[PDB]
Curated annotation (Swiss-Prot):
Coiled coil: none annotated. Its EC number is 1.1.1.21, 1.1.1.300, 1.1.1.372, 1.1.1.54. Substrate binds at residue 110. CDD domains: AKR_AKR1B1-19. Its main location: cytoplasm. SUPFAM superfamilies: NAD(P)-linked oxidoreductase (SSF51430). NADP(+) binds at residues 9-18, 210-272. Changing residue 43 to N: Reduced glyceraldehyde oxidoreductase activity. This is Aldo-keto reductase family 1 member B1.
Amino acid sequence: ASRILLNNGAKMPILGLGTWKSPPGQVTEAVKVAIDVGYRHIDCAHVYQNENEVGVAIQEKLREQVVKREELFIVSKLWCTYHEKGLVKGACQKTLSDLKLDYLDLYLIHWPTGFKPGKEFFPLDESGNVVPSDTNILDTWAAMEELVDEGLVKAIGISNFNHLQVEMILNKPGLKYKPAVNQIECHPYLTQEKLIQYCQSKGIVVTAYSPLGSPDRPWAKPEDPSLLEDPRIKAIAAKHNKTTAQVLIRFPMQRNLVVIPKSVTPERIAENFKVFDFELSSQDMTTLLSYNRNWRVCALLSCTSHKDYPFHEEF
Ligand SMILES: NC(=O)c1ccc[n+]([C@@H]2O[C@H](COP(=O)([O-])OP(=O)(O)OC[C@H]3O[C@@H](n4cnc5c(N)ncnc54)[C@H](OP(=O)(O)O)[C@@H]3O)[C@@H](O)[C@H]2O)c1
Ligand SMILES: CC1=C(CC(=O)O)c2cc(F)ccc2/C1=C\c1ccc([S@@](C)=O)cc1
């Protein structure tokens, strides 16, 4: 069952390709291979610094008539330095330009935290803390809504929002378009039951990022755990004649989540897609859920004093 119906009426493929850390000289081939082997959803962001190269791939596959534009589901994200209402459209248009698209299927507020505008993605002061902007979630949301009305994006959503921040938007005076998606970190070590149930209860689809535990994240430490090497998960994969990665990808799918594993390795791109031919039992699902440790690999530790930092709240 390969697409989920969003609250904007569009169908989103439940498996997509992640692109954070995909080197610019490797990501065009990664996305080409992905489309060839059946991916129809690509997760992008301006801050990843590789959208031009992602776009080359998409355009070549459209030109080759491997796929039609309406069959693709392209996602990107508004970076923190563009939260001011007057900057949102230009940020979207830069992403559209780089991706070689005339619309996005989904555009997310990447984080609830606005930063001072400028050339620096992470403008810093002396204490190691980010320089905020005096922007707020609701005004940025209104600017996102304008993108729908101007035809630049088919759906808007959020990422890394806690349930109180989602509630803020849902309670917005004059709300025109509800968020379609909340994209959050989710894997067996950070199972997210409370936030997922909240979002799903509101008709908001959850996308699970870092489903393999982001082993390539640049701040990984040698003592940190590794989902791909967890012998309990290895054992579940063996029972099914699948890889650990395949179990880690199938897991969120069975929770009615979208999942976006990243790879630049052609064999793994193909492996990661081969997750529609097996099912985890309910007992296996509950067992995987039992591995939760509240272990977050993307904690945005330079922004813990920002007024809108999302991870002080329980969920
Ligand atoms: N919204 C947000 O704030 C946010 C935050 C984080 C991530 N995301 C999105 O979510 C995507 C996925 O998360 P992520 O990039 O953090 O990490 P991930 O998908 O959990 O893990 C990617 C790592 O796993 C490796 N890998 C992939 N498939 C494998 C397989 N079958 N066997 C063994 N190793 C495998 C990759 O290696 P190779 O590439 O070398 O094959 C890479 O090192 C991102 O790329 C981005 O699109 C969003
Ligand atoms: C969590 C995270 C992500 C993941 C993502 O969105 O997919 C990311 C992606 C990028 F392209 C660049 C930075 C980040 C980041 C956190 C982070 C990194 C360095 C700093 S420096 C200011 O010390 C601060 C925060």
